[PDB]
């Protein structure tokens, strides 16, 4: 419950991806262990879904990373900037 | 003691065969390998120690190996002889042979040199006789003598010792 | 000749070869298995090359053909391929 | 320096002295094991200290006769890391199975266990062609020799399957050794890569296609690998850890060695492209065939097949940015897939068998080493700062710029799947126990936890250790700075 | 000299004859016993021919050695092969041809 | 020297009949045995055919590899 | 008829795969770029003039080493799946008075030749390995002509480790200088070395290796031919 | 194409043929024997240069006149490789039928 | 009077478990080849 709380202080402090991405697996590993007490049947079924929202998320970034090149979540506001004026609606 | 270095002496004499040009700065080699191979295993050719040796008996046995050969081309030849086209039709042998040898390396040298003779095939040697898958029988079913199915070899290898 | 001979020797490694695996007796199969080490030891050496022919012929004639049937000794000997009631079932 | 050549002669000279020991005695046989395999730990780390020192890999020559004429044993930046984990694996091997293997004939299961160890010094560190192939088959008749070790039928059959399949994968091997010789002329990989660029475009490819394709029978994907999750499961409990921690990892360095050292020839695309298919044709089956599985031996057997296929995703898809990122996981599954074995065989051992009713109740009826298997089995989909987190991480990245989103979605699917069988196993041993028999194992209280920290070190500081395969990766990147380092 | 080229070709149609003879037999035995005569002493004939092929011929003497190692060592090894594929092949059935007796070995077998 | 080799290639592939037919178990095995002594004095006959003094060293050496082979092949039949 | 014929196609199709794979050169010279230097300089950097012998034991040293690895797992695995503290023959079924007596005679017959090719490996082809697969015939030729012929194991896998051991004894008194460095013709280390070129002073340092190869070799597959011949 | 290179690989074809389509055991084992025979028959039928011809003698023939001293050595490790792994899978073979009931693939249910 | 079940009987029903009938496509088929391959009926069959 208080490495929780450093994913969630990790995820809005999150300027970067790979800082981002961390916060929130560790987040929603700790609230899994959390209720991963007792009625496991409804334990695992919040963590493989939020595992398949964290992972699709690892997709989504694979993506943008190589479309772009680059990883840093900063500049890649510039360069979306730069192409904004079929690929992207699976984004 | 002295059947260890007759063994060492038989396997020397065959090194000694074995290579074509024997170097004397070779010998040595082949002389100490065979000094260990005798070692290792000169339990096995104890026919009565190292008395083999007698001037006689090697001579003899050198005067007749052409008399066995003989033997051979005569008697495969025969057998040569016996494909014929439609005819000369062998008949298989059972018919038996009995010795009265000791020294159980004659036993082998009579059963190799039956072998050795028109098709005479030795199977199942016992303690008392010999059993020949004979050619085509005329001679006897049951046979008191050698010479009537094979040459006397028996008095030869009587005298191997 | 010379490639006469060479193709004498090269089909009968290929026929003892289709017919070592076609038997069912598996001492038949050992048999096949010698003579394919025969014409492999003979092709060896027709190839010149003598060292892979001798050690070829002190492994496969009588270290891998009489490894085999050493193993076939107390196990089966037939395929058994199965007349009968309760049969290929 | 050429004294450091010992990776293979003392596991060797001390492989044939244990024959040697076993009939004066009973006593020092399974001693004997560990003081030589401290001895490797030694002899290990002065390699390791030596080619991270400066920038370049001692050539240990096979004589007075320099490359290509001769064998070099090119114990690179990967090399000296590899043999030095494996050393000291094998060390958490020799002072596990001391009592816990007992069963059997050990009197001649040592020397066994020591030419797995040569087979693994061997492989990774091999120059020849030809060396790598007998390497291997050594390593090959280890596994065919002890994964038979417990006649008990069902074991019997075990290796059946597997000495069967690696004789056909070692023979069409030689085969493609025969073709790559067959264009060149030449068998040392360093005057193999400067001449395999235009010897013939369609030689070469038929021959690197068999080489993988028999290099990788030994190793495991997909067509190649149901011996494996055979092989875990019905074996000695040691030597469970030493094949799924090394034997996997040789065979998938070794196939991803001489990939890239052809890198320049057509077709070699389409053998890659084949390469990532089959890898992701085997994160998905073997990491979703532990999901309706009853042993638990099987349950972790399928796991290490699906860390392993992820290893060749990365090893064979661009150049860098995952493949010295690939080294990252295989250097990190090998302990965290020690770590897993080791609870299993403890509990194969105080127990009995490996079934889940057997298995079941462990959380207040076993001590730590139920936490072992805990924070093992937290660390394969990689939730916290962990490590395999961050190789898996690292891999998933690395599958972007080419082999794309297909590649991904599979592999990272089978993490959703093995999300699933670890959570209802650690379930079943934590909270629905209802029997407290205490049991004490503290034989291994220790040295499994001081295992199992060694992951939460590594977890927290990554950084001192992925500096090491930047370097690391340069044996496996390029072939220029890897021929001019050798001739 | 020339009496070598004249008995290898006296030692090869004694091979071939031989392999006629193996393949002209009605039984196992007799193909057994006439394949193990002509086969085995045309062998030696072959091969002390070429031994005296190269006794002015070859390069000296010492091929001649060799042959006479190896047609004494092959004239001894084959009675023991022929005597233990003979001796097998009575047990487990494998009966004879119609010879005029058979019964006494079989006979001495069961004389108890 | 040349004509003799074609002439045990004539031998060699005349006694194939034997193996490939025969339908008891040891003719195949009578097959075997004999082909062994045929390829021996074949591998003599090529030490003339080559002028090699060293082709002679694998043929004493396959002229004992038959006859362990067929001792062994024909001791199961016995015991 | 659906899987046999189907094996067909695709082993034809396999066939025809490695026949156009095989259009490397129809048997011609152009081959060696590299096998040129092991028969140019064979004669006068091992001593040994047979070709093979000098290029698998000197040359390509570490690979009769994983050999002698192979064969020596081979012996200790066939020990570790048959293994039962009891070991007795089959049923022995004696059958013949002239094949006792027969492998008898002819046990030194063998054991006087197959140390012959293991020694000679300098103008006679081979090495160690066919020499001691011919001293393992001969311990099979004692083995399947006795009713016993236990030869006596504590002890007998003592001289194969010792044999081993005497190969890698070379490597390591060899780590006396460099890597390999033949310990033996180059340097007076415990003898003379180097002197003419033929059959006499025994070349080099290759052919003692192949003694030493031999016997354990040599009581290689003895060892599991004796193992295998164990009923309970 | 020679005769060598097609038998070689023909050897391997037949030793290939007998993994797949037949069933009982020691007919699969007698297949990968044979199978490693023809790999080792084409290790050598790679460098023959169809000519000069002596790989040991050294004495009474001229140098670079040998064939192929590269792969004479690379089939002296890879015949006897066969034959340990043979010896290897023949305890198994033996195992399988002392503690399960029969030799065939289909039959053998753990 | 010992009644088996509550709901043990009622089983689930599930989509792609048929597959596991698709076991027998590499089996050897159980028929018998009546021409000719007998059947030999009992020893004392009716007739």
């Given at each position: 419950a208080l490495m929780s709380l450093a994913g969630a202080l990790g995820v809005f402090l999150a300027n970067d991806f790979v800082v981002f991405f961390l916060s929130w697996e560790i987040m929603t590993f700790a609230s899994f262990?959390?209720?991963?007490?007792?009625?496991?049947?409804?334990?695992?079924?919040?963590?493989?879904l939020s595992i398949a929202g964290a992972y699709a998320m690892l997709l989504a970034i694979g993506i943008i990373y190589a479309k772009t090149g680059s990883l840093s979540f900063p500049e890649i506001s510039a360069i979306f900037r730069q192409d904004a004026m079929t690929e992207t609606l699976l984004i | 003691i002295s059947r260890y270095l007759y063994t060492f002496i038989v396997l020397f004499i065959i090194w000694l065969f074995l290579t074509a040009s024997l170097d004397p700065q070779e010998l040595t080699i082949g002389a100490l390998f065979s000094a260990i191979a005798a070692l290792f295993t000169y339990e096995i050719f104890t026919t009565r120690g190292l008395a083999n040796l007698h001037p006689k008996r090697v001579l003899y046995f050198i005067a007749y190996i052409p008399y066995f050969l003989w033997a051979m081309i005569m008697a495969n030849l025969d057998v040569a002889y016996r494909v014929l086209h439609p005819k000369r039709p062998i008949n298989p042998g059972i018919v038996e042979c009995k010795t009265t040898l000791t020294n159980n390396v004659g036993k082998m040298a009579l059963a190799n040199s039956i072998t050795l003779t028109p098709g005479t095939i030795t199977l199942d040697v016992d303690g008392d006789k010999y059993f020949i898958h004979w050619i085509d029988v005329k001679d006897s079913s049951v046979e008191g003598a050698s010479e009537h199915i094979t040459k006397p070899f028996e008095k030869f290898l009587r005298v191997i010792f | 000749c010379i490639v006469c001979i060479e193709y004498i020797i090269v089909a009968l490694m290929i026929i003892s070869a289709i017919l070592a695996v076609e038997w069912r007796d598996l001492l038949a199969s050992t048999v096949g298995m010698a003579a394919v080490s025969l014409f492999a030891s003979i092709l060896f050496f027709f190839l010149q090359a003598p060292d892979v022919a001798m050690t070829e012929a002190a492994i496969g004639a009588a270290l891998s053909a009489a490894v085999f049937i050493f193993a076939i000794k107390r196990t089966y000997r037939y395929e058994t391929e199965e007349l009968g009631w309760w049969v290929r079932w | 320096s050429q004294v450091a050549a010992l990776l293979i002669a003392l596991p060797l000279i001390s492989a044939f002295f244990v024959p040697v020991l076993k009939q004066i005695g009973k006593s020092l046989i399974k001693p004997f094991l560990v003081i030589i395999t401290l001895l490797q730990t030694l002899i290990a780390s002065w390699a390791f200290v030596q080619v991270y020192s400066t920038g370049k890999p001692i050539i240990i020559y096979a004589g007075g006769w320099k490359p290509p004429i001769g064998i070099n044993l090119y114990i690179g930046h990967f090399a000296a890391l590899f043999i030095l984990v494996i050393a000291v694996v094998s060390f958490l091997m020799?002072?596990?199975?001391?009592?816990?293997?007992?069963?059997?004939?050990?009197?001649?299961?040592?020397?066994?266990?020591?030419?797995?160890?040569?087979?693994?010094?061997?492989?990774?560190?091999?120059?020849?062609?030809?060396?790598?192939?007998?390497?291997?088959?050594?390593?090959?008749?280890?596994?065919?020799?002890?994964?038979?070790?417990?006649?008990?039928?069902?074991?019997?059959?075990?290796?059946?399957?597997?000495?069967?399949?690696?004789?056909?994968?070692?023979?069409?091997?030689?085969?493609?050794?025969?073709?790559?010789?067959?264009?060149?002329?030449?068998?040392?990989?360093?005057?193999?890569?400067?001449?395999?660029?235009?010897?013939?475009?369609?030689?070469?490819?038929?021959?690197?296609?068999?080489?993988?394709?028999?290099?990788?029978?030994?190793?495991?994907?997909?067509?190649?690998?149901?011996?494996?999750?055979?092989?875990?499961?019905?074996?000695?409990?040691?030597?469970?850890?030493?094949?799924?921690?090394?034997?996997?990892?040789?065979?998938?360095?070794?196939?991803?060695?001489?990939?890239?050292?052809?890198?320049?020839?057509s077709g070699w695309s389409s053998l890659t492209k084949l390469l990532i298919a089959m890898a992701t044709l085997t994160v998905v089956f073997a990491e979703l065939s532990a999901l309706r599985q009853k042993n638990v031996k099987r349950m972790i057997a399928y796991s290490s097949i699906g860390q392993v296929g992820l290893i060749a995703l990365a090893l064979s898809?661009?150049?860098?940015?995952?493949?010295?990122?690939?080294?990252?996981?295989?250097?990190?599954?090998?302990?965290?897939?020690?770590?897993?074995?080791?609870?299993?065989?403890?509990?194969?051992?105080?127990?009995?068998?490996?079934?889940?009713?057997?298995?079941?109740?462990?959380?207040?009826?076993?001590?730590?080493?139920?936490?072992?298997?805990?924070?093992?089995?937290?660390?394969?989909?990689?939730?916290?700062?962990?490590?395999?987190?961050?190789?898996?991480?690292?891999?998933?990245?690395?599958?972007?710029?080419?082999?794309?989103?297909?590649?991904?979605?599979?592999?990272?699917?089978?993490?959703?799947?093995?999300?699933?069988?670890?959570?209802?196993?650690?379930?079943?041993?934590?909270?629905?126990?209802?029997?407290?028999?205490?049991?004490?194992?503290?034989?291994?209280?220790?040295?499994?936890?001081?295992?199992?920290?060694?992951?939460?070190?590594?977890?927290?500081?990554?950084?001192?250790?992925?500096?090491?395969?930047?370097?690391?990766?340069?044996?496996?990147?390029?072939?220029?700075?890897?021929?001019?380092?050798?001739? | 000299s020339l009496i070598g080229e004249l008995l290898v070709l006296f030692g090869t149609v004694f091979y071939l004859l031989s392999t006629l003879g193996l393949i002209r037999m009605p039984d196992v035995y007799n193909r057994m016993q006439t394949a193990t005569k002509s086969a085995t002493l045309g062998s030696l004939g072959v091969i002390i021919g070429t031994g005296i092929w190269a006794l002015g011929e070859g390069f000296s003497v010492a091929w001649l050695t060799k042959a006479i190692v190896i047609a004494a060592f092959l004239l001894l090894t084959n009675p023991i092969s022929a005597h233990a594929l003979i001796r097998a092949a009575y047990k487990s059935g494998i009966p004879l041809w119609e010879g005029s007796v058979v019964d006494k070995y079989k006979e001495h077998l069961e004389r108890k | 020297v040349n004509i003799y080799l074609l002439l045990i290639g004539v031998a060699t592939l005349l006694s194939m009949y034997r193996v490939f037919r025969g339908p008891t178990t040891v003719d195949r095995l009578v097959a075997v045995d004999i082909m062994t002594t045929i390829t021996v004095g074949l591998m003599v006959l090529f030490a003339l055919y080559y002028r090699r003094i060293i082709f002679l060293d694998v043929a004493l050496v396959y002229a004992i590899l038959s006859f362990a082979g067929v001792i062994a092949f024909a001791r199961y039949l016995e015991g | 008829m659906l899987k046999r014929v189907l094996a067909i196609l695709t082993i034809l199709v396999i066939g025809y795969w490695l026949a156009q794979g095989l259009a490397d050169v129809p048997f011609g010279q152009d081959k060696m770029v590299v096998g040129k230097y092991y028969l140019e300089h064979v004669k006068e950097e091992t001593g040994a003039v047979n070709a093979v012998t000098a290029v698998?034991?000197?040359?390509?040293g570490l690979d009769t080493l994983g050999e002698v690895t192979v064969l020596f797992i081979a012996?200790?695995?066939?020990?570790?799946?048959?293994?039962?503290?009891?070991?007795?023959?089959?049923?022995?079924?004696?059958?013949?008075?002239?094949?006792?007596?027969?492998?008898?005679?002819?046990?030194?017959?063998?054991?006087?030749?197959?140390?012959?090719?293991?020694?000679?490996?300098?103008?006679?082809?081979?090495?160690?390995?066919?020499?001691?697969?011919?001293?393992?015939?001969?311990?099979?030729?004692?083995?399947?002509?006795?009713?016993?012929?236990?030869?006596?194991?504590?002890?007998?896998?003592?001289?194969?480790?010792?044999?081993?051991?005497?190969?890698?004894?070379?490597?390591?008194?060899?780590?006396?200088?460099?890597?390999?460095?033949?310990?033996?013709?180059i340097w007076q280390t415990w003898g003379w070395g180097h002197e003419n070129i033929g059959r006499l002073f025994s070349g080099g340092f290759i052919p003692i290796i192949y003694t030493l190869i031999g016997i354990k070799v040599g009581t290689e597959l003895s060892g599991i031919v004796d193992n295998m011949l164990k009923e309970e | 194409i020679s005769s060598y290179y097609f038998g070689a690989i023909s050897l391997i074809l037949i030793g290939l043929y007998a993994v797949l389509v037949k069933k009982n055991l020691l007919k699969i084992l007698i297949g990968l024997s044979i199978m490693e025979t023809g790999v080792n028959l084409?290790?050598?039928?790679?460098?023959?240069?169809?000519?000069?011809?002596?790989?040991?003698?050294?004495?009474?023939?001229?140098?670079?006149?040998?064939?192929?001293?590269?792969?004479?050595?690379?089939?002296?490790?890879?015949?006897?490789?066969?034959?340990?792994?043979?010896?290897?899978?023949?305890?198994?073979?033996?195992?399988?039928?002392?503690?399960?009931?029969?030799?065939?693939?289909?039959?053998?249910?753990? | 009077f010992r009644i088996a079940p509550e709901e043990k009987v009622k089983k689930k029903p599930s989509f792609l478990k048929p597959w596991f009938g698709l076991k027998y496509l590499f089996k050897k088929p159980v028929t018998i080849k009546i021409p000719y391959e007998f059947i030999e009926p009992a020893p004392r069959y009716r007739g």
């Open positions: 262990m959390m209720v991963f007490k007792y009625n496991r049947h409804a334990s695992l079924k919040y963590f493989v | - | - | 020799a002072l596990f199975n001391f009592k816990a293997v007992t069963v059997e004939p050990i009197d001649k299961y040592a020397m066994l266990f020591l030419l797995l160890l040569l087979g693994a010094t061997g492989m990774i560190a091999t120059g020849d062609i030809f060396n790598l192939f007998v390497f291997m088959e050594i390593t090959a008749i280890s596994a065919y020799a002890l994964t038979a070790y417990n006649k008990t039928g069902e074991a019997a059959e075990a290796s059946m399957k597997y000495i069967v399949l690696g004789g056909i994968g070692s023979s069409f091997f030689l085969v493609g050794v025969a073709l790559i010789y067959g264009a060149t002329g030449t068998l040392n990989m360093a005057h193999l890569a400067m001449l395999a660029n235009d010897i013939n475009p369609t030689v070469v490819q038929v021959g690197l296609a068999l080489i993988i394709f028999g290099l990788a029978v030994e190793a495991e994907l997909f067509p190649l690998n149901a011996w494996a999750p055979d092989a875990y499961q019905a074996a000695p409990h040691p030597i469970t850890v030493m094949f799924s921690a090394f034997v996997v990892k040789a065979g998938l360095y070794a196939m991803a060695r001489i990939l890239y050292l052809f890198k320049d020839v898809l661009g150049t860098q940015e995952g493949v010295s990122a690939g080294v990252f996981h295989m250097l990190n599954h090998a302990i965290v897939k020690t770590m897993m074995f080791m609870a299993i065989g403890y509990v194969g051992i105080t127990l009995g068998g490996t079934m889940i009713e057997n298995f079941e109740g462990l959380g207040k009826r076993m001590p730590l080493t139920s936490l072992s298997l805990t924070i093992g089995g937290i660390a394969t989909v990689g939730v916290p700062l962990f490590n395999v987190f961050w190789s898996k991480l690292r891999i998933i990245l690395a599958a972007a710029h080419e082999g794309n989103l297909w590649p991904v979605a599979l592999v990272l699917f089978a993490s959703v799947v093995e999300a699933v069988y670890y959570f209802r196993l650690i379930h079943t041993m934590w909270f629905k126990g209802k029997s407290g028999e205490r049991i004490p194992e503290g034989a291994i209280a220790i040295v499994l936890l001081l295992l199992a920290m060694l992951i939460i070190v590594i977890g927290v500081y990554p950084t001192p250790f992925w500096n090491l395969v930047t370097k690391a990766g340069s044996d496996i990147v390029e072939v220029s700075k890897y021929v001019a380092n050798v001739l | - | - | 698998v034991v000197n040359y390509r012996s200790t695995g066939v020990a570790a799946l048959l293994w039962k503290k009891k070991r007795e023959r089959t049923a022995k079924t004696e059958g013949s008075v002239v094949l006792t007596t027969g492998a008898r005679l002819l046990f030194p017959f063998i054991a006087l030749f197959g140390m012959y090719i293991f020694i000679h490996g300098h103008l006679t082809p081979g090495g160690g390995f066919p020499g001691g697969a011919t001293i393992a015939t001969a311990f099979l030729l004692m083995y399947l002509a006795f009713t016993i012929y236990e030869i006596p194991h504590r002890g007998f896998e003592v001289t194969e480790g010792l044999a081993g051991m005497g190969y890698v004894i070379t490597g390591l008194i060899g780590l006396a200088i460099g890597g390999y460095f033949l310990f033996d013709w | 084409l290790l050598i039928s790679i460098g023959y240069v169809s000519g000069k011809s002596a790989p040991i003698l050294s004495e009474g023939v001229t140098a670079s006149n040998a064939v192929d001293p590269i792969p004479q050595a690379l089939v002296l490790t890879a015949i006897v490789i066969g034959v340990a792994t043979t010896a290897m899978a023949l305890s198994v073979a033996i195992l399988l039928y002392e503690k399960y009931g029969t030799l065939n693939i289909e039959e053998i249910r753990r | -």
